[PDB]
Structure formats: C-alpha cells, structure tokens
C-alpha cells in the first residue's frame, strides 16, 4: 500500500467569494440609483 492523496476542496470559499461579489454589484447598482435621483 501507499498513502492516498485527499482532494483539495476550496469550493465553498470560492462560492462565498462569488456571492459576496454579486452582493457588492447589487449595492453599487443601488448607489447609482440614488445618484440618479440628483
């Protein structure tokens, strides 16, 4: 036998990154909406 190699899994961190960036873009859109009211 030889030692197996556990697959690296950072999928959850990456998913969180993309969700946070989506939230950021949504907030920027809302900011622009307020600016347009001027």
């Amino acid at each position: 036998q030889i030692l197996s190699i556990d697959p690296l899994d950072i999928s959850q961190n990456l998913a969180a990154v993309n969700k946070s960036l989506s939230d950021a873009l949504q907030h920027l859109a809302q900011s622009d909406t307020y600016l347009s009211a001027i």
Binding site: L3, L8, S31
Partner: protein
C-alpha cells in the same frame, strides 16, 4: 431673492439625502468586497497548506 434661495436649499437638501444613501450603499459594496477578499485569502492559505502538508510529503514518498 429669498424664494430662489429657498427652492435651491430644498433641492440641495433632497440631493444631500440621496448622496448620503448612495455612499451608504457604496460602503456596503466595499464591505462585501472585503468579505470576498477574506474568503479568497482563506482559500489561498488552504492551497498553500495542502501543497506543503499533503502534496510535498507524497512526492518525496513516491521515490521509495
């Protein structure tokens, strides 16, 4: 005249409230980016840790 100054003052006050709300949303966006950056930094540390603790030892081991 006073009438002109007052209309302008009211227009400006309304604009100021919109500017405040806009910056609040911008700040919220930046906070979201900070969270994204932290999550990505955490992922990168995990990558480093995997390379040093699992990959490297396994390569050396593959020689014997």
């Amino acid at each position: 005249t006073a009438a002109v100054a007052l209309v302008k003052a009211n227009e400006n006050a309304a604009a100021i409230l919109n500017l405040k709300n806009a910056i609040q949303k911008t700040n919220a966006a930046v906070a979201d980016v900070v969270q994204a950056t932290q999550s990505l930094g955490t992922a990168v540390q995990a990558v480093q840790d995997h390379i040093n603790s699992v990959v490297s030892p396994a390569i050396t081991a593959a020689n014997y």
